[PDB]
Amino acid sequence: MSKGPAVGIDLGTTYSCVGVFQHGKVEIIANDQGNRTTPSYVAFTDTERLIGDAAKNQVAMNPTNTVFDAKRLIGRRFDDAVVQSDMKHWPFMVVNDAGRPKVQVEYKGETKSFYPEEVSSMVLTKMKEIAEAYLGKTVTNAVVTVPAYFNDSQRQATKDAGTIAGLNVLRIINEPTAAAIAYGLDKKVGAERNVLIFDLGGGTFDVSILTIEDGIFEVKSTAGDTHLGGEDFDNRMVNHFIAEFKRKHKKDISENKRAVRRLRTACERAKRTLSSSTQASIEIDSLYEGIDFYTSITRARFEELNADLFRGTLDPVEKALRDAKLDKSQIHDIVLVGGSTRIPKIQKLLQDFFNGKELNKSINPDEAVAYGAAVQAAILS
Amino acid sequence: GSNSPQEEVELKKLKHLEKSVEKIADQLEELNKELTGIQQGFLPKDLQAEALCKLDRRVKATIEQFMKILEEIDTLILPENFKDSRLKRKGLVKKVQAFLAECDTVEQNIC
Ligand SMILES: Nc1ncnc2ccccc12
């Protein structure tokens, strides 16, 4: 293969995305399964190492040896409060190696341990291959994104994951900076600009405030909830349905893992439909004890079940404005990123908070960070 | 008759799902034949329990494939006038649930 262009990689907690700037536009690259995002999963089996979709597809079968959430561990010490709190909820083992965490798995019948940057290098290798398969050219140069709150150790560990994967990391840029670049906020004429990035996706909630002057970016403040996302909204819907099944049939499905999974998968889909329709229908034959479960949920009912969680997204916004020493009227631009920003109620609450101001939302929220990174990668080539 | 061209689209998706169920069922039958083989085979009593537990990954993969079929069938919305599609959907779920119960007997008898 001949030499290829530079790419933009959004290395996410749950999913990763790769883009390329060509013919005056960014193209988000679909993976071998045709998906525009790839799960940040690595599975170790009795015979092979699986990455992405193939790794996520067999998690129910091999939970202990399937690694994900490496981004929550990357550049951290084993004794970090974040490491200690998160490991209780993971099915895979996290061990202490001289103060550093390592995921421990069974691989080809042997006990093996990996540093979080080695796991992230496997995901970056997959992103590099996805780009090469589409372009039909060798991909070496990339811009890799990190959250704005990442420290020196977390940024260095991410760059090290890039190097391990055979990538030449042109630059490591903040995720909110990448989203601002996607909308070309840096190219708008005039004086200094105060930009608010509202990132609700990939199991985390991040609010960042940035200032752009003559193409120069400065992070003024960061806030959020490290464990808030779409899954929480799904859980509320599942609880609502479980209670509805009890009311209608006087039967508890919650101890049948397969019934709960069928219900959960259907709620995830009904949630996505409620972003473009005002009602979602669900038909599940023989859900539990031979009972068919045919029901529906309105957008309003969904909004109500999640009312505290949705309203709660404004507390980090107020905290970020306070830490940046800014009033809400001083924000020139609001950018939505992450799949959950597609929820109409979340957009409504955010627009009403900014007294009817229009939101930058035309770029697919799941892809906007990779989009901005791809633009940056083309600029640095 | 009230048979609509739109219902043909749904019946075609259901027939593809039935063919996928037949393929997973053939793997479950090969697992049952391998299970029986080890049990009434040439291996010593101790070496049989190890060989049988080596089928666990395959039995778990079979269960997962039937679960993904259930999830796929669950995306279908069929109006009340789609009687043949509603009957085929019901029949297919029950067939998959009976194969899932067999997978559970295998899973409870290995390891
Ligand atoms: N993650 C999502 N949350 C809400 N609505 C959506 C709509 C389409 C795709 C993803 C989502």
mmCIF file of C-alpha atoms and ligand atoms in Angstrom, chain A residues 230 271-273 275 339-343 366, ligand 1:
data_model
loop_
_atom_site.group_PDB
_atom_site.id
_atom_site.type_symbol
_atom_site.label_atom_id
_atom_site.label_comp_id
_atom_site.label_asym_id
_atom_site.label_seq_id
_atom_site.Cartn_x
_atom_site.Cartn_y
_atom_site.Cartn_z
ATOM 1 C CA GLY A 230 -27.605 6.766 28.368
ATOM 2 C CA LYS A 271 -35.207 5.584 23.850
ATOM 3 C CA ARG A 272 -33.539 6.238 20.435
ATOM 4 C CA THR A 273 -37.022 6.428 18.712
ATOM 5 C CA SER A 275 -35.509 11.477 20.098
ATOM 6 C CA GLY A 339 -25.264 10.571 21.687
ATOM 7 C CA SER A 340 -27.451 11.510 24.712
ATOM 8 C CA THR A 341 -27.497 15.235 23.633
ATOM 9 C CA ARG A 342 -29.909 14.041 20.913
ATOM 10 C CA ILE A 343 -32.595 13.829 23.677
ATOM 11 C CA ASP A 366 -21.106 10.659 18.497
HETATM 12 N N1 LIG C 1 -27.761 7.641 22.560
HETATM 13 C C1 LIG C 1 -28.918 8.175 22.118
HETATM 14 N N2 LIG C 1 -29.752 8.713 23.071
HETATM 15 C C2 LIG C 1 -30.900 9.229 22.626
HETATM 16 N N3 LIG C 1 -31.350 9.291 21.374
HETATM 17 C C3 LIG C 1 -30.530 8.750 20.414
HETATM 18 C C4 LIG C 1 -30.976 8.772 19.068
HETATM 19 C C5 LIG C 1 -30.200 8.245 18.070
HETATM 20 C C6 LIG C 1 -28.966 7.681 18.352
HETATM 21 C C7 LIG C 1 -28.498 7.640 19.637
HETATM 22 C C8 LIG C 1 -29.265 8.166 20.713
#
